[PDB]
Structure 1
Amino acid sequence: HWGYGKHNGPEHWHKDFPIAKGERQSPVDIDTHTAKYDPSLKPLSVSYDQATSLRILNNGHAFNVEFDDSQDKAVLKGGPLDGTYRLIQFHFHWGSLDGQGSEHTVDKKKYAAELHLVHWNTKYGDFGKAVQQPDGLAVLGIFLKVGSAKPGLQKVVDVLDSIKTKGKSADFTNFDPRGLLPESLDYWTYPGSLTTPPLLECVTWIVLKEPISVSSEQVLKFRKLNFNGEGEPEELMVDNWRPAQPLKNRQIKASFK
């Protein structure tokens, strides 16, 4: 029954998921003045040319755009990754205001939203087996700031009215996640976890440097989603982000000087 309210939010997750106080928990604050530049980092490889979007779903915490991950259609190689990682779904973490909403923070700066493209390591068979492995997931973190309208997002924004409440799902085929990427693929990387329960410490996090801009009219329709199910009292789906967690014995490496 976890969520982001006052009585089931990120401050109560450790009572049902004691790994919330673990070692490699996410998100964290990316301190650009302590993030070491790693010249041995390879360029990222985003092969989304055969990505197959299937469905968009309101799961009571966010909205997920699921992809056909039965084959290596949309993968993520290069960077710090050893092997292939299939894009399975992406989602967003936003807030009620433009000064908050992102999960990762850059020098304590909060962005309006944060895009998470989730990939699972193919050598583990399926997603359920990869989440139990330290190098099982690779999530690509892309910040969203309020500004010009992002054209690659309008197809996502226009469909939100059909998935307003929890449990609603809608067809969402032929979507191209390449439009959601910024111009540059410079990134930070650090070993992390899921930012939602069960908070499994299985994620190699890749947070891109360059944010993307979205018009306030776009991010406003993110805030018109409902946490509740249909017929229940309306609770706006806002501030569905986890605050930053202690970095502890972890080093964030950057692909750019």
Structure 2
Amino acid sequence: HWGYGKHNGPEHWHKDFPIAKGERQSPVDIDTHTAKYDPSLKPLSVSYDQATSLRILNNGHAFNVEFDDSQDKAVLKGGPLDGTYRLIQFHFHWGSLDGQGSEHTVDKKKYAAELHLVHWNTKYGDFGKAVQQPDGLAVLGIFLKVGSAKPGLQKVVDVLDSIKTKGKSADFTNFDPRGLLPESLDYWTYPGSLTTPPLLECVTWIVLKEPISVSSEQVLKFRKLNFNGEGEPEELMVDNWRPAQPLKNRQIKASFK
């Protein structure tokens, strides 16, 4: 039922999901001047060398690239995190035009899109148990701006024609997510939530400061996907982002001086 349209979008979600008005909702605006360096943060470790991708799915809201999370392979450690978090999937949020699409904003500036690499805390055994815990998930967020092409994104772009409509999937083995990172791992971090229903308040957000550049042609292909299923009237999959939510009783910490 929930979506991004006028009649089922972010301003309606609270009726079924009252936590939408909660105390640690995401995304937020990142005020870079108020964000403070945190010396208690440990070095961040993104260890994706043995990642095993499996499948790509159009779920009617975005597309997910899914990974084998039955054992410790691609993991995120360090930074603000206690213990080991396993990669389960990544997806994007994007706009109808280059001037909007990100969920987090930086001094109110909206990027063209935002990549979310989703990980769960292995001390809870499964993703479903992890989303019953305050520290169950860690999402690594990466901004996309439009400029030069990102070579490591092209394999994703070129499979999208095969998953145009809701419910379609395709094999997506042997994809290396290391090709989606920027050079620097400088980041901001804060406690938040899932940005889509069920909006659960389980996430440690780690948002990289350096955006990746993708080409106009790459993001234009994201915008050819459909929210609807096969045979149904075409609704382009665009503007699948939630706007910034109140910061409330939180502080954003920076990894860099």
Shared fold (TM-score greater than 0.5)?
yes
Aligned equivalents of 1:131 and 1:34: distance in 2?
30
Matched with 1:53 is 53
Aligned equivalents of 2:165 and 2:43: distance in 1?
39
Percent sequence identity is: 100
Aligned equivalents of 1:250 and 1:10: distance in 2?
22
**How far has the Cα of 1:43 moved from its partner?**
1.6
Q: Deviations over 1:155-186 (max 9, x none)?
A: 00000000000000000000000000100000
Aligned equivalents of 1:73 and 1:199: distance in 2?
27
Aligned equivalents of 2:230 and 2:131: distance in 1?
31
TM-score if structure 1 supplies the norm length?
1.00
The number of aligned residues is 257
**How far has the Cα of 1:40 moved from its partner?**
2.1
**How far has the Cα of 1:49 moved from its partner?**
0.6
Q: Deviations over 1:49-101 (max 9, x none)?
A: 11000000000000000000000010000110000000000000000010000
The DSSP-based 3-state class of the residue aligned with 2:20 is helix
Aligned equivalents of 1:2 and 1:35: distance in 2?
33
Q: Deviations over 1:77-127 (max 9, x none)?
A: 011000000000000000001000000000000000000000000000100
Aligned equivalents of 2:132 and 2:241: distance in 1?
23
The DSSP-based 3-state class of the residue aligned with 1:159 is helix
Q: Deviations over 1:13-67 (max 9, x none)?
A: 0000000000000000000011111122112101101100000000000000000
> Is 2:195 aligned against 1:195?
yes
Aligned-residue RMSD, C-alpha: 0.4
Q: Which ranges of structure 2 fall in alignment gaps of 5 or more residues?
A: none
Which aligned segments of 4 or more residues in structure 1 are displaced greater than 3 angstroms? none
Aligned equivalents of 1:36 and 1:12: distance in 2?
34
Q: Which ranges of structure 1 fall in alignment gaps of 5 or more residues?
A: none
**How far has the Cα of 1:205 moved from its partner?**
0.2
Aligned equivalents of 1:44 and 1:61: distance in 2?
30
Matched with 1:107 is 107
Aligned equivalents of 1:178 and 1:79: distance in 2?
18
The DSSP-based 3-state class of the residue aligned with 2:157 is helix
**1:104-183 superposed matches below 5 A:** 104-183=104-183
